[PDB]
Amino acid sequence: DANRKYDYKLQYYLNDYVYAYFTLPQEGDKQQAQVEHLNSFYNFVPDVKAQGQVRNPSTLLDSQLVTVEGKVATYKVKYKEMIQTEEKELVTGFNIPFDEKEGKYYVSGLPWFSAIESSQAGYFSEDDQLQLTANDHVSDSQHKKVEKFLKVFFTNYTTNQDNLNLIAKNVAIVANTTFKTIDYTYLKKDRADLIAYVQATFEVGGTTHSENFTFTLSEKDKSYYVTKLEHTIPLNYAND
Amino acid sequence: DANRKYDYKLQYYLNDYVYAYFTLPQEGDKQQAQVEHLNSFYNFVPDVKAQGQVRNPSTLLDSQLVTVEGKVATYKVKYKEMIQTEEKELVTGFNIPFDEKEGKYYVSGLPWFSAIESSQAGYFSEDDQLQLTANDHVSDSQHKKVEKFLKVFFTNYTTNQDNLNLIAKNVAIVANTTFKTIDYTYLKKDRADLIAYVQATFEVGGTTHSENFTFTLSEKDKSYYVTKLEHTIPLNYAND
Amino acid sequence: DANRKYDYKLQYYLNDYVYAYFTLPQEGDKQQAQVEHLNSFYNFVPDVKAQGQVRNPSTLLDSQLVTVEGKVATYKVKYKEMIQTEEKELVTGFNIPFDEKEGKYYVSGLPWFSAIESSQAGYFSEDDQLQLTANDHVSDSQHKKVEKFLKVFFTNYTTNQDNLNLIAKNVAIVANTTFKTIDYTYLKKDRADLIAYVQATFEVGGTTHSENFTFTLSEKDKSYYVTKLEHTIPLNYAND
């Protein structure tokens, strides 16, 4: 535990290179001095056959170190360039060849730009879509006993830890929340347990949001005790 | 070393979801467009039984990805909500169900709010409390020789690496510091070594702070050589 | 994959301590209250023999958690101190002794300042320097066929994925780029393949930059197909 070792020197070295690369101030005192600091990252300033570049003042707005593999670090970069004057926001992937000598780091050649790749998945089957459209086969009198219990549960859940402890196992109260409404309830028996799949509305500051729950309910006296609580409803919820 | 592989795509995907979730601009062109980008994170936009939510403009101020386990990412979140107009700062825990398909990621259902949990430890025994209250059994003449040596040590420590090298093994000088005072010294023999437990005051810019040291001192000529330096004093320091 | 476990509670605990340590507001309501929050990090507020410190208002500008080892966390810190009034930017290394009790954390004693250490490597042999100075032994008629092909390649590379797919294996187009010029070409046979070591200039927004490439070219009809593309030129490129 407390004796674990972490070394983030490489990740922060690469962050410092990205900052040095995408940062160019306006005033010359500042500008050539920032270029010297950028050049300090290389083993050797890369050999460039062009006479020079067109350079505009620029500010780094954001960077994400997404991958390191095979001595290449890949970033997502957001920056702004002042063209003399208009300011333009730009994004690019940015790829840094680097290496290590005696536990120290350097950039080993000209970096390269790439198109940002999204890690967003797509192409899902409609079989994977949760819809809370099922109607359960539990009595209207059990529904009304469960609804009364759930209103007490969510009131305690948003207010009072000791009140919540009496009716639930190892559930923490939430902060800065008001319980508004129960919007869906599907009930299913599992031997002596009653399973409740529930959606409810909460207000935090001035904003409302909905959340899902799976309650495992045991009968206690004339009410219930929550032996288990989850914060998702599974696709198979209405498979009884 | 330099060929290590790092993949942070999941951590930054989740950061981008938190930003998309807690960011809502004022102007409609911007607002519905930010909602579309938020919706792009889901496999399917979650089924919500309420007609709609009350939504206010909001800005993300800070987020910490504290845990990922069992396909749930947990954040500490700081944001501000503009209620039309007053601005209110809010904090919450925020829990994201997600999954992975073919090396890509998605949010799999309604996230849930939780109370922020502190990782601060408490309930310590007074046995664990360091107090620099002990009086050593070393002569006043050794104390004065050690005090003179320690003033040279701390002067060099704050000034001159080559001067420091003559009187200490593998100690680096500190930058931007002035040595002010030695505030505590406990001396103890360990065979031929003299151990010095020391607190001293330093000034950095306009501010003073105290630090602790454990010196291991060897006799060199009519003075000392520091064979070892630590930056803590142990609870057992006055167990001779 | 999606079931991986991450725990960053220690790293963010230490970030919160650094923020608490280097943050001191102006107004007393705020100031003594920030000191109480700072003191909450310790198992016990450290025993300090000085009567007190000189404290000035201060803001944390940046911090990097570079190492954790042997119950010491080491940071690079940037802050600013208001001396009453002038503002001064300062940098320091900052070292935190900490420990863990029952999965929770605490700071165990007085932290210590250190000089920032750069992870920049130096002292390279000129043998390791890439210079694009070699002249190849390939015919001027092959050079002109390759130059025409490379202008098509870089046009597609900056424009049209489907056009690029016809002439290259698994190469992604770049975004927001205009191809300007080929500035260096070294050609070498490798059995039936032709290797091209190339530098080219690109414009992104208002700014130009150079990049290096190693193409592996197969003959296709009266032109070429790129079977492999790298974004570096190796030191041995002109060893035929």
Author numbering:
A (entry chain A), B (entry chain A), C (entry chain A): 86 to 169, 174 to 329
What does the original paper state about this entry?
The main model of our study is OrfG, the sole VirB8-like protein of the conjugative and integrative element ICESt3 found in the Gram-positive bacterium Streptococcus thermophilus. Bioinformatic analysis using constrained consensus TOPology prediction (CCTOP) predicted that OrfG consists of a single transmembrane α helix (residues 37 to 57) followed by a large soluble domain (OrfG64–331). This soluble region comprises two NTF2-like domains OrfG64–204 and OrfG223–331 (referred to hereafter as D1 and D2, respectively). Our data confirm that VirB8-like proteins are predominantly extracellular components, assembling into a conserved pattern, which serves as a building block of the DNA translocation channel.
